[PDB]
């Protein structure tokens, strides 16, 4: 039918910048709407009828377009504007897939720490090695695991937090799960973070046969 697409899918900017995001329609439609969502809460009416601001919306926001192309614009962006914005219109089944606006800030290297499997998880036949990478920027970051001098990439799961409310950093966990036997069969465990704050990685390790 008439369907919507949005662009860009993700973008980041420093506060003080102009911001524009686009919503387009496979054929001509009118009276476009725009909804704001932040993690953990419901979508919220922001702009409606192509150009009308909902109540409580700063005058830095403006909406425009006609036919098959519409946009939402922000002057002098503020940190509170960070959110995902979705377009939708009265003849459309599926909402546009959203532009996520994120906050740009100064680069920062992660604080890294590594944790051997706990004694009580071992008693149950399992072994998770946990590595935290906290308070870095930008979000792009690489983690490498080495066991006994060899690189390993099988039982690893990585999870990022949403951009932090207070300082706009990101944190991530990287978890390597094994059984007890495979853990008992190797000695040196290393967690390595390669960011772009560092040509040289940040390294944290332990030996199983210690403690």
């Amino acid at each position: 039918d008439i369907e919507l697409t949005q662009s860009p899918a993700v973008m980041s900017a420093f506060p003080g910048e102009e911001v524009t995001m686009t919503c387009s329609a496979s054929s001509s439609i009118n009276y476009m709407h725009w909804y704001q969502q932040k993690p953990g809460t419901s979508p919220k009416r922001w702009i409606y009828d192509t150009s009308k601001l909902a109540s409580g919306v700063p005058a830095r926001f403006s909406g425009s377009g006609s036919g098959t192309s519409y946009s939402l614009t922000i002057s002098s962006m503020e940190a509170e504007d960070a959110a995902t914005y979705y377009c939708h219109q009265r003849s459309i089944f599926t909402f546009g897939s959203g532009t996520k606006l994120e906050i740009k800030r100064a680069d920062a290297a992660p604080t890294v720490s590594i944790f051997p499997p706990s004694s009580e998880q071992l008693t149950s036949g399992g072994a998770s090695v946990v590595c935290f990478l906290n308070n870095f920027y930008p979000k792009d970051i690489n983690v490498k695991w080495k066991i006994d001098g060899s690189e390993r990439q099988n039982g690893v799961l990585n999870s990022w937090t949403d951009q932090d409310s207070k300082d706009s950093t990101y944190s991530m966990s990287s978890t390597l799960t094994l059984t007890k036997d495979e853990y008992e069969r190797h000695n040196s465990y290393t967690c390595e973070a390669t960011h772009k704050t560092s040509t040289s990685p940040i390294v944290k390790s332990f030996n199983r046969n210690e403690c």
């Binding site: 944790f115 978890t175 403690c211």
Partner: protein, 221 residues
Amino acid sequence: EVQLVESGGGLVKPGGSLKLSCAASGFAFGNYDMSWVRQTPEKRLEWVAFIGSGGGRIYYGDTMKGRFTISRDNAKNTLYLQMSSLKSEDTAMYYCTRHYNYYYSMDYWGQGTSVIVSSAKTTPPSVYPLAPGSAAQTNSMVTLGCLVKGYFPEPVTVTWNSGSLSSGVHTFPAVLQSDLYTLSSSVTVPSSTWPSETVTCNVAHPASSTKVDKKIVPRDC
């Protein structure tokens, strides 16, 4: 004033059914068109159903295929959505919304009610203390953790010293390993205060109605 409060969500097996409700306050419920909109785990938003002020005109979304039924009771200010023959792709957060004028923007939304459709069964979590051990740290700060593994369904809530430790906490989004969710939480405190002053993580799983405390203590080697 205006309030939209939803209810009836929960966990159901494929093929099953469930009826959602949305209680209203603060306005003349009979004057307004109402809708249900759903957000998939992929954050995708879909117009599931629509109903006019009187209940005489109705619309359903494309993938609905006869299995949804929207109704209202303007005498009890309540909106309903009956779901039949559920599929896994019907898993979503479901929102009750109100319409403003005849271009059909949605000016008020409810808090949402979560519908999960799978064969998995409710499982309490395991909670393991993450102390440094053979990877001891040696600076002004120390980072500790708790590992939460093997629970279904979401969510869990993690606190530290019953909420007293709030700064320096990162609790990461859960990840699905084999129909069971796993999550970790870290906290950073001054190096001088541990184990001198106790650190405990508090894990709550509402669905299994379980509460467990794990003190983070140094190991025996």
